[PDB]
Amino acid sequence: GPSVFLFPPKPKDTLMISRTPEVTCVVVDVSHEDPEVKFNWYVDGVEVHNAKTKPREEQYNSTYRVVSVLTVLHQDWLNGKEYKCKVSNKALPAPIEKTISKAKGQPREPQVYTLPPSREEMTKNQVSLTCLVKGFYPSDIAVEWESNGQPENNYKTTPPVLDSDGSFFLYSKLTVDKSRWQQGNVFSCSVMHEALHNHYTQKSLSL
């Protein structure tokens, strides 16, 4: 029969007060003969009724994709409230109940360190600027680079890695033309995480 997948909000929508975080309940393998999908939403066991249904999408594999979205409050999600989506469909012998929430565990503040390029790299065309983000929990995070107030696109960030002390760490590598680094421009590692003061911190880096 049809299957249900309940997704958390984007970490950026939960930590940035200008954005709106939403929990998404995706129902796949919806049949054409019984496309009706009843949605029951519960926040900490209490049913809520402010969820909207996304437009039905034909998947061109003989099934429908039916999606419900519930806006959540920022502090509600960050305070670890549980959101239950109950999906009902005539192709289901019994309703499917899924429940998600923020990763449990005490949030730990990330330590952000900028590491300059190695002296052995200055023989290449482009050098590597390193940002070490360690000791953070939960794993949800976002890392970006910028120079003189302008965003820097040419960078890659490793996924979070579980450390030996139960926290997470990652690395972000910004690649710049060696001339830029030797020019002396300041580069900034911008890290977003719930356990940071105001969910944000910057660490500069220059020669």
Binding site: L15, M16, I17, S18, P151, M192, N198, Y200
Partner: peptide
Amino acid sequence: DCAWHLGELFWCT
């Protein structure tokens, strides 16, 4: 107090 990133209001204490 408040933090700002690229001009977007992040958060305020």
